[PDB]
Symmetry: none
Subunit: 309 residues, 2 copies
């Protein structure tokens, strides 16, 4: 499953331009789905099987990033965040744009003191991106205003661990894709690959259950609520104010996991019945998000036992 | 071109399941092309010629339709649209599915009172499709969830006009096919028959063969001014590059010189582009109408411009 994860995490698809991720999902699903449609609202819906129960599995395909907002007369670009990206993750980083263009992130500051003051309280109007252009006009042909860029970071193996950009939520996408690749479904199985709605503001199909496959913070680094750990298994979410029928879903998955010796952890926080299953991830919103591949496999196991028979 | 247009418009090809459209196009182009390929999404790319200038002609092969989202206990189907299909265009119609199955669209609410307050606020969950099934089991075996359907309408002549489903954009597909059938190319000519909307074709120019609304009906949309028998419609894009405007200027001189009828359609852009459109009445209904002379004038225009 390693190559599927590389391809998905490495895909270009910031909130706004996810279309290359949709192509990668579909080509990976070629031969494993009975059909696919992109519904009115930007969603790739795929399906397999014909059981009476209709189960949806949903992961979102957009990643955090940057959008170009101005260009200056020397060809330096002004950027603002897309999704929850911190400027501290951007100092000295390279950024990939849609056309292949690579840019370098720098920070303003006339004097040694002015630059240390800027890093103490860093803001996106003290950053710039350098794409090698010399003129406002040479830069606008390469990356015009409104262009999206992403971490120019790719997938690598650190010991057991898998590290890449955009584990949140390309790993959820990979879990769904690998379920469709392996499953003989006892249900009518939908795979829904959504775009997150921008924060200043329902599926195309009726189903009986929907299971969101997400990323959850793995709080097992230095100086760290009985929270989620890498290699603890998939994190089954305990949501307050869940319905009878949602709670039944959660109890199913638990029983499946115990019955089959599938490691899992229970995650407590501090209309179609729904559950949430999350992959524990270190360093969310950085260029080197980290997962344990045994949790990813544990998660595919659990969903195949639950939906496959 | 009459049989070409009948075959293409009547073909089954809703977004996703276009194999019959692709197969008919290739059948019509046998011996007229130098090669083809079907890409990963289902775009068909064909080529003819070896001139220095490379021109892509592009039309899209998918049509509007419905998708089966549920089956009930007595075999009736629930549907959602695929493309811009209006629930009022589905009242009383037949829908044809990929295996030949035919369904009748009905609307819920027996009482004559609820029937006329549904058709005020009509919605796809007031609709069902009857395929003569008597249970979910019959019905799911004929037509599983996720099955696609199209209008069950075919080609007819209406006093010198042609009427069919999916003129948008099978008529653009027949324009491309006919150009390749007739032309001695001076360019390297590519034909791209696209799926849901680079193609891996490096290309000097690209001309979209589309459908435009013919606003020459009673109380027609005021904004539109294109007309059947007015010729191919040449899109004026307010924001065209020098090279895109160069293409449009080239088409106007061809049409003026060879006495071809044409009309001007007025309101990251890398590959230079222009748009040539067939004026069409009743787009998105089972009975879209074109004038064959616009189609022939469009074919004429492209052949005088791209070779002979």
């Amino acid at each position: 499953m390693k190559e599927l994860i590389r391809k998905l995490t490495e895909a270009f698809g910031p909130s706004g331009r996810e279309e290359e991720v949709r192509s990668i999902i579909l080509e990976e699903l070629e031969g494993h789905i009975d059909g696919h449609r992109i519904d009115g609202l930007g969603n790739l819906i795929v399906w397999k099987g014909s059981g009476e129960k209709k189960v949806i599995l949903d992961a979102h395909i957009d990643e955090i990033g940057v959008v170009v907002t101005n260009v200056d007369d020397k060809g330096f670009l002004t950027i603002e965040p897309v999704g929850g990206v911190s400027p501290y993750m951007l100092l000295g980083k390279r950024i990939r744009f849609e056309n292949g263009t690579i840019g370098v992130v720098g920070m303003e500051g006339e004097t040694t003191e002015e630059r240390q003051e800027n890093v103490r309280k860093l803001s996106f109007d003290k950053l710039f991106i350098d794409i090698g252009a010399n003129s406002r006009e040479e830069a606008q042909k390469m990356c015009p205003i409104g262009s999206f860029g992403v971490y120019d970071s790719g997938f690598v193996e650190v010991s057991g661990k898998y590290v890449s950009k955009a584990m949140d939520d390309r790993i959820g996408c990979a879990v769904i894709v690998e379920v469709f690749k392996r499953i003989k479904p006892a249900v009518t199985l939908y795979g829904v690959f959504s775009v997150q709605e921008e924060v200043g503001l329902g599926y195309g199909v009726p189903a009986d259950e929907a299971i969101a496959i997400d990323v959850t913070d793995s709080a097992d680094t230095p100086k760290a609520r009985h929270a989620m750990r890498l290699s603890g298994g998939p994190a089954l979410k305990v949501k307050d104010r869940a319905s009878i029928s949602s709670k039944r879903i959660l109890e199913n998955l638990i029983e499946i996991a115990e019955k089959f010796d599938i490691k899992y952890q229970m995650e407590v926080l501090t209309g179609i019945p729904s559950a949430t299953v999350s992959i524990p991830t270190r360093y969310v919103a950085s260029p080197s998000e980290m997962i344990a591949p045994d949790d990813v496999e544990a998660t595919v196991d659990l969903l195949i036992r639950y939906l496959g028979a």
